[model samples]
Target chain A: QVQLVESGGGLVQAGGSLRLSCAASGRTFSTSAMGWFRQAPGREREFVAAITWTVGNTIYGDSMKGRFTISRDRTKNTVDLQMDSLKPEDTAVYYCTARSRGFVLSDLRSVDSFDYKGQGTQVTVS
Target chain B: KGEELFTGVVPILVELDGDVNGHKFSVSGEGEGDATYGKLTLKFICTTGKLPVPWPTLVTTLVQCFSRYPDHMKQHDFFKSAMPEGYVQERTIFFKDDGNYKTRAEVKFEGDTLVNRIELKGIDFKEDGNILGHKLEYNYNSHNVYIMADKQKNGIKVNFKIRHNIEDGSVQLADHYQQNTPIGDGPVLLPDNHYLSTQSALSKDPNEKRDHMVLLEFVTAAGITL
Candidate 1:
């Protein structure tokens, strides 16, 4: 099966910031909008936001409005999400989703769910 | 029953010291039926004689032990040997700049946090005399963490959810300094909302559609179908 493998740091204490990477291979990565999500142990997943390639920007969720920065490097074919203001509550599993959109007439189109998933990083802010 | 729901379950097992160090432990017993999140799980009955370890302590111990490895991580060499001979470890994509790697790991320990109606179970070597006969019970789980790449090629329409009652002209859409703009080619362009407006009206303005126009950014990195 196809997979997304995420790599980065660990043992990030509260108030300490960290950067994580989601590397996608084995498929065409240029076709979808990359998305991120957070799922703490025994908790439901919360949608973080979406990043588009054409515009090179992101729309964040209410809870994570100010703490995250999503960037992409085309040469490396990877997207970087940098989060700051670390808190213990931020400890959880972070996943990257690449969405493939099906365009309708003119401007209407539906965003597809993430087709690839990097093995989520298990992060704990303490 | 309610207590069982709130409290985690421990498994029972018999053991055999497969390796000389007596550290290579294996399970031979079984655990009582339990369900969580709709999945039926059985306890990994270890040949070790201990039982009734609290879930929190067990997990903490496992994490602590694994943290000792170089890079604070363990390789899949152990798993490769445990699985079938033909089984091959999947080649996964990982990002490492100076010195960092992502990993999925599991650990275990012993504890005493208890629940009613269910007593911890184990085997007595005296009566069973199976040489390595003992019902060892335990609870376990797994976790992972990682970071994003320095960049990527995203094909998404970036839009900001603006507020109402905010004057259209007052909001500077393109002049925001906090926005992280994109550099390469891909798809539709929109505004980056890294740092835009604080007032709810900035995101709620119905008529001020352009007021919340974000810096649409895309990545050059090719993405796999997720």
Candidate 2:
């Protein structure tokens, strides 16, 4: 019953900045890791960043390092991704995903899996 | 458990040959089923390595779906319908020098095609004789796949672009290479000759050219026609 919905859109000029949000429902956002990814028009998809807010750890893809920032508001059950100094190449569909953890022996463990994803937000830069 | 799952596929054996980094090798294995609940297993042995040689450090398994469709259906639409309900594809690659690398991928029927999002675990590689842990991710559909494996220790990156031909159950690895040089400034093309005849003449330094480069061209065919 977990669900993630991404919201944020419209056009940005070259060198502009944008912030996209992903709202979570039917799950505990604090216990899971949230990630952001993007797909350029007619191009391949790329990982941007991921944040495990409970542990205060963030991992960014090499290409996204320094250009993207990922943060979360556990109180609001939401994750946010911000990008700056953008170029036309930054125009793409950005998606947010939530990782589901498996429980064993009354303990929750992290697994390499993303079970819920948002519909993705398409942003155009001119 | 692994053996039982492998046996359940009911494989039909076959053999194939190919070369890797100038070494000749044979891919002997078995494949089972078609369009639904398919499985493939391969064992590779090299012919030119040193005697009592260590086993090759690389192995991979790929699962592809080939669907037959009616005349009015578009190919992408056919791919959507061809995916069996509750279908799951999993791959585990073992390296002699490293640990077992396992992949758990989820297949989603999106729009008119099938998209796969894979998460890899326990994959490690040696860089300059140092074992480094890596994170591998894949986002792909029936037509193309984009794979990225990044070493968490030293930022060593390997990227692969794979093209899938659903009509014939064939896969063409278009580009597979490592990136040590900074690509953040812009798009750059490093020299690559892994599949070219001239690769033998290229420099031997691993840093000069992306190391552990592999070229793949393989097809899946039904061993026995019903």
Candidate 3:
């Protein structure tokens, strides 16, 4: 039904880059936004970056700004993340989530409630 | 004549108080049993000044939070927190009685830990009613809040963790601040704000040495719920 099958895992050399993917289903690839969250070892999930609904309106968590890039391939109903300049701390499970439009029907980007989520990808930067 | 249809789970009366981007808002609804256990569906219209729709613009967002957990929603103060006019918070439940509650259950937080806080005053464990205990299942999928009360054990077993099993990572909490319970205790505290808090759990504790006190009081009109 509705699930986000994710990829982009395994080992990565420090200072390397990785491209994470989230293949979405159930809803359409049109007019819907998705969130990318990550939980490093011994940490909680943080709102790292977002590929907003419609057009191109991306917002990165203050810390993730400039370090991460999020893109959506509507043709395949998929969303992807491009991370670069990595470090050991970048080793964490990255999750992509579908946002409930109700709380975020406007310009308020990060306040929306997260609904459907993709099983995450575990990336290690050694 | 009439195409009769009643496709709506009577909104279980409860208002969870929290701020949306800074604007204080209350989330109220019931764990519907009609379709796959009360679809926790609600809607908010936002444009500019948000909520109830277009101030500067009009956009609708469907807020179906907490899939289904009727047992938990029924006993919470938010379930009973409705003032005759609407929803209120904390100890401020006035003479506006709409719920069928006789007594309220309150869980107290000692120093900084939000774990063992249910004071024995507001709750009775030995009462020969229903050992209406848990529902603390901040589950595996986006996480669910489960709180179970064991009558024989005479204690409250609460499991509140924001475990995001994104498909399948590692079981860990991202966030959860007593949903449905009236407590102005948290907002966004995950590292950038304490990102470590997800796995640590103790990172959001504002810290010790301050006699940090918290309470989770459930005012029920339903059966026995602790």
Candidate 4:
């Protein structure tokens, strides 16, 4: 099973707008099922994923396309290591929490919209 | 629960972020004239944490929502990610005139107004009346053309409704978009009610029965399929 570095592991790596930027240089997309982990940047490069379903002999009818598990890779001289399984998965999610004492602040599409002693309920407006 | 019918081919998905009492709710639409379209009907399942009152001011009437799409579209890049053909078609045609290399633009500004006489042709409607019944022959060729209008402080009034029947010569109030910031394609009265709308024209392939669908799709980009 391919394990992914959770994007919510710390304070720096935010999702939404920054998700595309986090996959930077010195980063290895070591986990996979199906994904576009481009090793290069800029608009000049087209991240191509060529896939095919094999038959009796063979033919190329190509097609193709995250979860976070965060850790450290000391030898590479990096502190904030990112892991992601750009899985062949499809589904969306959200979570909720409250009370800074017993609360989970950041996760998935988790909303910080909460109260002190009430429900740990987060809602996605989609 | 009274059902609202939507019959337009252009799928319009308006996600109006609104609030009710206090909770955030959404209201997206359908038919029933503006009058028949009743108040907000919600099944709450249970409901308002901090929502603004949802109808007139806080929430947009579908008219204001669609009308302003053009304005924001010019300011933002969001629409390029793909939106409605109706809303997209209007501005895409406007920008299809990409400047310096592709755009065909020209202007002559004066003291405070611009009467763009892009009137490249010299055929006036003065010749339209000599043939009498020919007034009905081709509507644009009639003695009644758009009454001239210019700047009025900031907004101006111009009655530009076409008479489907030739004998009905007076400008109808239904076509008046007075005090309007008339821009792009044109300001619509309701939805497709363009002030200058006339009888529908035939198309070479897909039948676009609206007055300007011919101008929009046929003249703009071929990809803007009707």
Candidate 5:
């Protein structure tokens, strides 16, 4: 069973910043790809970014190019996301996801799917 | 506000690998194959927009639509062997301009050959605008699937050619994008959201609607009998 937990959410004034973290367990952190997503109130969810530590590659969605950063610490088995220059538009629920892969040869590759998701961090900007 | 103008179809290429009744197979345009399997070329024509729903939700909905067919094929071992597990069938639902489009895909075996079909129906909107459809004729022995779709509003045309062999337990989605504008020479790697946002912000003329086309590629295993 794989599990992910999201933390660090609260209110931030307009133009402020915030940092959130997602802790992962029941799987190897260094080998799998981790992703970040956001959902504004009354809006659809959007893909933010995906970081593959093993491949040293990162893929970001069309809207999250620079305002957000996704990073991970292998030692702590945790993934982190940071956003700055906040606005009321940034008020939303943030989530962390882990890609599920099957064993192939000597490496584990992504399955084009996210199997585990964090509860979510609700951030409100005035 | 008026009917959204649907134009050119977005092209998408895909590669698939899996097994039928324990017989392993691999298919792609550039890959090698044996008697049990060969290479195949597939394409999907998709509409383009800001994608009203989240990506994950779209994926989850597609997955669920496909999973329901496994039970319908209980008579055949081939179906059982090729049935996708829960993990392999997650798709998110996205909102279209009028409302939502409900979609589903399934695979079936006819003798030794396999056929794949996908359908999209408009929901929660006017009946005239509620239609998206896909038909694929696949020859499992030859490792080929011929795909066809009727034109759609705001749709882009995509041609899918298989690339390489995929093994069990190693499903992957390799996506590349080709923007419709003349700024790029050829198919480019997908850019970040900031680039898209900036471009959209610049084109915010409120009165004129922009026509954009994107080509997407998905490379991965089919997650059957893996």
Candidate 6:
């Protein structure tokens, strides 16, 4: 049973900085890449990007170019994402994603046909 | 082989072009039972590019408790939008693009190691005139393209398609468009180079606006046996 849990602490003020973390268990961290996302109040979630530590490649969201950072600790089997230059508009739920190479082998072009998912992290910017 | 022990799970991650640096993402899978793969969970966390108002965290989880193939793979669609309804701006997918996917990714449990086949599908395109412009902006949408893996090799494939409209301008909208432009000190509005529109006289009305969908496809091969 592979599982991921996200936890962190911070109060985001307009123009301030916000950081968060996601942890994992029951799976091999080296076999897949991790992706991130964001959601605002009363709206659907949007795609952020992901990190492939094995390749040192980070794919990010189009709207978060200057304010987002994604990384991982393979030794601890954990991953983290950071948002800075914070604004009230940046306040919304955040998420982390894990994708397996098995799925990639099945078809990286049509990955949506495989199980790709996330855990919810809510943050408020005042 | 003694009943293919496909009981374990795997996870993955990604970063779109428009996000901040060091953005974090999480994905997980689990399986159990005679006819099921158990459960799976996915999460995303970013530092920048969120809405101004705070809201509850959104987590999408799947319980594959009962199914035929214990090693069955599932696919999902996550979109990015500027409006609350996910429109006006654009939509982007988390998975990359490698090749044209007429099949799916493959995972084989051979000997003592697991064999995996991966492909590429997440890079940005610079436009070479292969994609149709007016159809992309009028009838079809480009946001649903997903990448798939080849069952026979070590790479992935891409497949995307959408509806379009027969419009009133030269085909000028087919250009390489990245998802992270607006936030990266780049242009915010979709350039005339990447979109098709009518004459200036009929441009302002929403009714004259054409409905289109974009689809991208490609393939790549990468993975290891664990």
Q: What docking grade applies to model 5?
A: incorrect
Supply the DockQ value of model 6: 0.03
Predicted model with the maximum DockQ: 6
Predicted candidate 6 versus true structure: per-residue lDDT over A1-126, tens digit per residue: 457777774576778777788887775422356666677778876666676544445656667777888888877877788888877766777766675432222222232421345567788879
Q: CA shift at B187, candidate 3, in angstroms?
A: 21
Off by over 4 Å in 4: A1-44, A47-63, A66-126, B1-8, B18-26, B30-60, B63-226
Docking class of 4: incorrect
Worst 10 residues of 2 chain A by lDDT: A102-111
Which candidate model has the greater DockQ, 3 or 4? 4
DockQ per candidate: 0.01, 0.01, 0.01, 0.02, 0.01, 0.03
Docking quality tier of model 1: incorrect
Score every model by TM-score.
0.33, 0.33, 0.35, 0.21, 0.35, 0.35
Q: Which should have the higher lDDT, number 2 or number 6?
A: 2
Better by TM-score, candidate 6 or 2 = 6
Q: Give me the candidate number with maximum lDDT.
A: 2
Write one digit per residue (lDDT tens) for candidate 4, span B1-226. 0011111222221223332223344433311111121111111110223222212111111221111123212222111111111121100011011111011111111111111111011111122332212323222222121212233422223243332333456321112222222222222222221222121221222452221101111000011113
Prediction 2 global C-alpha lDDT: 0.43
Residue ranges of candidate 2 with Cα displaced over 4 Å:
A102-112, B1-226
lDDT, residue A112, model 3: 35
Report chain A TM-scores, every model. 0.82, 0.84, 0.85, 0.17, 0.83, 0.80
Off by over 4 Å in 1: A103-112, B1-226
Compose the digit string of candidate 1's lDDT tens values, residues A49-108.
666543455667676779988877645667777889878887888887764331111111
